[PDB]
Design a binder for this molecule. Structure first.
Ligand SMILES: [Ca+2]
Ligand SMILES: [Ca+2]
Ligand SMILES: [Ca+2]
Ligand SMILES: [Ca+2]
Lengths: 121, 121, 121, 121
């Protein structure tokens, strides 16, 4: 299992110790407060009122927690995933990333605290 | 395991099928959008800017998800709990509740979708 | 989870730290060598050639590992149980017992090493 | 998870659907009755009285359940493994095998019923 912080300004993302393998079931829980620029902060579902202006994940709001598994496209995490199985052919190291527009991470602040574990399978 | 909706306006709370017993390890993941009155909505950590004016749980923000286990006091849930063990002497049915001031739930809206499972122990 | 030794000569049985509660899923693995009297020893399935002459569990062989949950009747364990749920209305402390005839445990020898854990549910 | 039968006469072994990956925790429970030649049968720990005359696994008795993980050497399973982690650098498909001497499987009989699951990690 892995526990760590994902900084909102970390454009490259936070690599974890989890390698997602075919058949794995995982659970993620994410908590905390972060911002994509404003003084206000939002939780791991991000800001439901902010327009998508080129987010790395178009299936989640700006300021949401997302992930990549190996060389996958981004997958929403939001507050977490409960006993979750990846799509077919998706495997590799899990990297967690704050959802923002490439090149605009510099004014970001805060972080999410995230737990990932593998479940029975 | 249990999955269901917790309505923001449900003052009595949403009873689940989970009976927390001594030694149990549980995981909760909560998602969604709710409000304690305003047109804006917040996630399961609630509104970090709103003053506590008599919330059922003073250890979480207004609009956060909280719970009671049996006849316990309220315990924050927020976005969820990862492989969590209850304090000593805490046991019984888990009821999930939106954090608001008693008697002020009528203007609430939205809901959270919540999964609870028991983990290995 | 619990790990410990179950002595073949322990007529009252070995109490564990596991309280089986409604809905629990458990796994047991049992190992080792024991005898109900002869110099030969048998594993946790017991001796398939020995007649039942009043065993505490008539659904397992003499020399098998069995259990009681609370005040239940005996339930075969044998080599173990994989992600197992008890019958309706069965609950309480798990006691592990060597299967022999009441009053004939004195000439027994050896023991089984047993792990019990609760699984996801 | 996988459940299936491992025939005592299956020299090549029974391939399972489990791929053991680095970091995995697994549980195995094995049950049943098999023989390496005699009319008598033994459980998954085999025959503690039979000399080793070239067994595929010298760390378990003749007639015991053993396994290979990928291209590993044989590893004892016996009655099972509880929340078990493999040695460093061991990974791949799990094949279950009855422990006997190469070229002497033809007179074997019976089988073991085996469950394998991955546990939390
Ligand atoms: Ca930004
Ligand atoms: Ca309100
Ligand atoms: Ca005896
Ligand atoms: Ca043979």
């Amino acid at each position: 299992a892995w526990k760590g912080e994902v900084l909102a300004n970390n454009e490259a993302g936070q690599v974890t110790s989890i390698i997602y393998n075919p058949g794995d079931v995982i659970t993620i829980v994410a908590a905390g407060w972060a911002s994509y620029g404003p003084t206000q902060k939002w939780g791991p579902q991000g800001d439901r009122e902010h327009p998508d202006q080129g987010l790395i994940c178009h299936d989640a709001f700006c300021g949401a927690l997302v992930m990549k598994i190996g060389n996958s496209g981004t997958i929403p995490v939001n507050t977490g995933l409960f006993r979750w199985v990846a799509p077919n052919n998706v495997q590799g190291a899990i990297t967690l990333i704050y959802n923002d527009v490439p090149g605009t991470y510099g004014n970001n602040s805060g972080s999410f605290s995230v737990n990932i574990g593998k479940d029975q399978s």
